[PDB]
Motif scaffolding. Structure first.
Motif, short mmCIF file in Angstrom:
data_model
loop_
_atom_site.label_atom_id
_atom_site.label_comp_id
_atom_site.label_asym_id
_atom_site.label_seq_id
_atom_site.Cartn_x
_atom_site.Cartn_y
_atom_site.Cartn_z
N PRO A 118 36.05 48.47 35.34
CA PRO A 118 35.31 49.06 34.29
C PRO A 118 35.23 48.05 33.16
O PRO A 118 36.21 47.51 32.78
N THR A 119 34.03 47.97 32.60
CA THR A 119 33.61 47.05 31.54
C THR A 119 34.43 47.26 30.28
O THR A 119 34.67 46.27 29.59
N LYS B 180 39.88 41.16 46.97
CA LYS B 180 38.55 41.62 46.59
C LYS B 180 38.63 43.06 46.14
O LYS B 180 39.21 43.92 46.82
N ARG B 181 38.03 43.33 45.00
CA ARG B 181 37.98 44.69 44.50
C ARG B 181 36.80 45.37 45.16
O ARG B 181 35.76 44.75 45.40
N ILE B 182 36.94 46.63 45.49
CA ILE B 182 35.76 47.29 46.06
C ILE B 182 34.95 47.70 44.86
O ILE B 182 33.84 47.23 44.69
N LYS B 183 35.57 48.52 44.03
CA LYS B 183 34.90 49.03 42.81
C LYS B 183 35.20 48.07 41.67
O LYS B 183 36.32 48.11 41.17
N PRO B 184 34.23 47.31 41.16
CA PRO B 184 34.50 46.37 40.10
C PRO B 184 35.04 47.05 38.85
O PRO B 184 34.71 48.15 38.52
N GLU C 126 40.26 56.61 48.67
CA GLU C 126 39.41 57.14 49.72
C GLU C 126 39.79 56.54 51.07
O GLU C 126 40.18 57.26 51.99
N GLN D 134 41.01 45.56 48.48
CA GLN D 134 41.64 46.69 47.81
C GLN D 134 41.75 47.88 48.76
O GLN D 134 40.88 48.12 49.59
N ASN E 273 47.72 46.58 46.60
CA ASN E 273 46.72 45.99 45.71
C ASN E 273 47.40 45.18 44.60
O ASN E 273 47.26 45.47 43.40
N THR F 270 41.53 51.51 48.37
CA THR F 270 41.14 52.65 47.55
C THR F 270 41.77 53.93 48.05
O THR F 270 42.17 54.05 49.21
#
Lengths: 133, 666
Positions: free
Chosen positions: B104-105, B98-102, B62, B58, B93, B60
């Motif tokens: 949100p639930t 691969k996601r860096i930040k998984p 940042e 990913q 993306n 991001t």
């Protein structure tokens, strides 16, 4: 802006091959007939002209005549004077022919000959008679 | 192209102009000063380049702002808006990363996706990527839809899409990096073998293809420069136009013979008049000679008149001989000239039957490319997607094209064996009614905020309907579905126990007997490591070979193979597969084409989403609830796997924008 070189497309042409169903096929049939038409017209003038070719067999070799290579003189033998008048009676103003008859007088010699003997040989009179024929 | 500007090209974007999509999301910048637009354009190109340079992770916001340089990494809301924009419309993306930040639930919103074809999967993965509740409903017991791969033992052959058309700015190039695909180039050389089984000689083979290519340009000239686009009200089809161009070339071959032979008569007949002078002159000369001889016979000495007579006749005979000699001079020029014209006759025929049959194979190929007979294709528009061609060799997938969808289906809620039977969309939500394909009585109901429909165009066109829409789709959408073309081309897989063809030749043709059977087994592919040969069936023949048993078809294949390589050389195949795409009820076709009377505009009409009437009269206008995606909805890249994938990405961004909100437009 232009069709591919060697490809023939004309608005005129295009309408004529679309104007109905079988119009394209119809147009080619005439060309197929226009073609046979002009094709046997060839074998028929090719036939006519092969008969005329046979009629000339031998050309005119037997009727030809040798050349009088004769040096072009200046004095007018009374003989040559008379060939002149009769040539003027049969040939009018065609000096080349008149000179060709006499045989040893140039065209200019003939040309000025008329003026010198014109009174003497009534050559106006002769010429009008040549005009009558 | 290379640099930051290579990223813009590889992303199908002009590196130095703001697109209309970009202007819609950033009106302040496009309408501002030229400097701002350039800053933005760089930030766009630079982010694309970052994502492109490593698409297994990913990108991001940042990561991005880090690697910008000032002045560009100065304004950080301009960077944030640009990164959000690209991420939303699947320009970065997308696919498998691969996601860096998984994620949100807790998920917001709920979307049913009909079909886990490539377009379906591509949206489903994006939507879930955006934190939405996404469930796909698949009629088949496998994903991929038209991207089918047949595997058995080490035999592996694609029955659906099998070619990647160039990586030059193709989304699949990024996907290939994401999921290993043995991508092998396709060597362009295709020899053509005739019905007897003898390879067409190279001189003839080149001569026809140019004529073919020459004919195609002429149609494009009939279309754009003569506006030959309507005949007796019905719009002209590519096939029609190719005939009006072959006729006009056969016309011209004749007009050319006529006005040539008509030069022979016009000279043969100058000769007729010349021989008539010459035979009537050999007659005057025959007579004069006689007269001169008789006149010369008189023995001298003679009177001067009798002496003039000889000379005058001699001159007159000489003058006539001059004439007759000048005329057999002229008779010589004409005699040669007729030999010249006879020596250089014009071409006898525009195309021979053998030549025409070979051409008919080049038309089979064109009915393969468009999966339809040429009569159907719109003359004006059939090639409208030709400007957006990618750049690069076309490729194949040695491991099968099935890996890409399976790769995409990872992590998605997919309900296989689930035939959607009714779509029901209302001002307050939608419910989708599906059954189980095995026992059809067992019924399913799905409620959701929005339905994304990637049904094949052929399914959408079924009468009576396979799928019912409640309330019914509006007339603009249904009319679009009738007008659009959905064609078909099938394939035959031949699995042998030994390579018995030219292994350095990827694909080789077979020339048909007829025009009517030009598509019937007209082309073969060596593409795989194993001894597998693929035979295509296109054109008018595709629709008819579906009514004929596999044995009869594999029969006709062996016989064609026997002629090209010898009866002893080709053994019985171990495993054989034949495709019936029109018969398949989950496709009812192969891929769309621009049918006559359709345009590219219809491809845009399919993509427009549907908005239902307010439940309560006088209530405010409702949100659009039904969205469409798939190969028949992307006008720029139709009938292609990349186009389907791009359509899925496009709807996911639009759906997300509608339900999650676009915070990047301020």
């Amino acid at each position: 802006r232009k069709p591919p070189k060697g490809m023939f497309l004309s608005q005129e042409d295009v309408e004529a091959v679309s104007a109905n169903a079988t119009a394209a096929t119809t147009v080619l049939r005439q060309l197929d007939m226009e073609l046979v038409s002009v094709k046997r017209q060839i074998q028929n003038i090719k036939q006519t002209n092969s008969a005329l070719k046979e009629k000339l067999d031998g050309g005119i070799e037997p009727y030809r005549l040798p050349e009088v290579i004769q040096k072009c003189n200046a004095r007018w033998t009374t003989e040559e004077q008379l060939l002149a008048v009769q040539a003027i009676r049969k040939y009018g103003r065609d000096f080349q022919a008149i000179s060709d008859v006499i045989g040893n007088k140039s065209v200019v010699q003939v040309k000025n000959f008329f003026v010198n003997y014109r009174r003497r040989f009534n050559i106006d009179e002769v010429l009008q008679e040549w005009e009558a024929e | 192209p290379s640099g930051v500007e290579g990223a813009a090209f590889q992303s199908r974007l002009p590196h130095d102009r703001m697109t209309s999509q970009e202007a819609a999301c950033f009106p302040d910048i496009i309408s501002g000063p030229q400097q701002t637009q350039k800053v933005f354009l760089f930030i766009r190109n630079r982010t694309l380049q970052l994502w492109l340079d490593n698409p297994k992770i990913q990108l991001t916001f940042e990561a991005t702002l880090q690697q910008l340089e000032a002045p560009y990494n100065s304004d950080t809301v301009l960077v944030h808006r640009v990164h959000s924009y690209l991420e939303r419309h699947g320009l970065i993306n997308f696919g498998i990363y691969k996601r860096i930040k998984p994620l949100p639930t807790k998920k917001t919103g709920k979307v049913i996706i009909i079909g886990s074809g490539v377009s379906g999967l591509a949206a489903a993965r994006q939507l879930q990527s955006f934190g939405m509740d996404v469930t796909l409903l698949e009629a088949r017991d496998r994903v991929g839809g038209r991207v089918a791969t047949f595997r058995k033992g080490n035999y592996v052959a694609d029955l659906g899409a099998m070619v990647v058309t160039g990586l030059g700015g193709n989304p699949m190039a990024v996907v290939s990096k994401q999921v290993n695909m043995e991508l092998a180039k396709i060597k362009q050389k295709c020899p053509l073998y005739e019905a007897n089984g003898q390879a067409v000689p190279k001189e003839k083979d080149e001569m026809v293809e140019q004529e073919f290519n020459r004919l195609l340009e002429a149609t494009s000239y009939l279309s754009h420069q003569l506006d030959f686009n309507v005949l007796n009200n019905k719009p002209v089809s590519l096939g029609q136009a190719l005939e009006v161009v072959i006729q006009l070339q056969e016309k011209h071959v004749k007009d050319e013979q006529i006005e040539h032979w008509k030069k022979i008569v016009k000279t043969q007949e100058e000769l007729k008049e010349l021989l008539n002078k010459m035979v009537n002159l050999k007659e005057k000369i025959k007579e004069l000679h006689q007269q001169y001889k008789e006149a010369s016979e008189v023995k001298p000495p003679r009177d001067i008149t009798a002496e003039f007579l000889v000379k005058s006749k001699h001159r007159d005979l000489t003058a006539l001989c001059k004439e007759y000699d000048e005329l057999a001079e002229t008779q010589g020029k004409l005699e040669e000239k007729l030999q010249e014209l006879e020596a250089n006759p014009p071409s006898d025929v525009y195309l021979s039957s053998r030549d025409r049959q070979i051409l008919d194979w080049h038309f089979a190929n064109l009915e393969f490319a468009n999966a339809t007979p040429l009569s159907t294709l719109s003359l004006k528009h059939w090639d409208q997607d030709d400007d957006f061609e990618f750049t690069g060799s076309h490729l194949t997938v040695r491991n099968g094209y099935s890996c890409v969808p399976v790769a995409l289906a990872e992590g998605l809620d997919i309900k296989l064996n689930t035939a959607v039977r009714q779509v029901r969309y209302t001002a307050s939500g939608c419910e989708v009614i599906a059954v189980n394909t095995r026992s059809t009585s067992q019924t399913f109901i799905y409620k959701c905020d929005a339905v994304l429909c990637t049904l094949p165009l052929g399914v959408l066109k079924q009468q009576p309907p396979a799928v019912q829409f409640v309330p019914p789709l509006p007339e603009w959408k249904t009319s679009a579905v009738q007008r659009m073309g959905f064609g078909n081309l099938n394939k035959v897989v031949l699995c042998f126990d030994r390579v018995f063809w030219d292994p350095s030749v990827n694909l080789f043709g077979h020339v048909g007997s007829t025009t009517a059977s030009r598509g019937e087994l007209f082309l073969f592919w060596n593409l795989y490591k194993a001894p597998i040969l693929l035979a295509l069936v296109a054109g008018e023949a595709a629709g008819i070979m579906e009514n004929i048993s596999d044995d009869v078809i594999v029969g006709r294949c062996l016989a064609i193979l026997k002629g090209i390589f010898g009866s002893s050389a080709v053994p019985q195949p171990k495993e054989t597969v034949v495709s019936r795409w029109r018969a398949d009820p989950w496709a009812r076709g192969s891929y769309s084409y621009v049918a006559a009377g359709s345009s590219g505009n219809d491809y845009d009409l399919m993509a427009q989403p549907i908005t239902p009437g307010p439940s309560i009269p006088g209530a405010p206008q409702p949100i659009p609830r039904l969205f469409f995606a798939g190969e028949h909805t992307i006008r720029n890249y139709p009938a292609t796997v990349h186009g389907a994938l791009l359509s899925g990405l496009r709807e996911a961004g639009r759906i997300a924008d509608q339900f999650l909100g676009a915070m990047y437009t301020l």
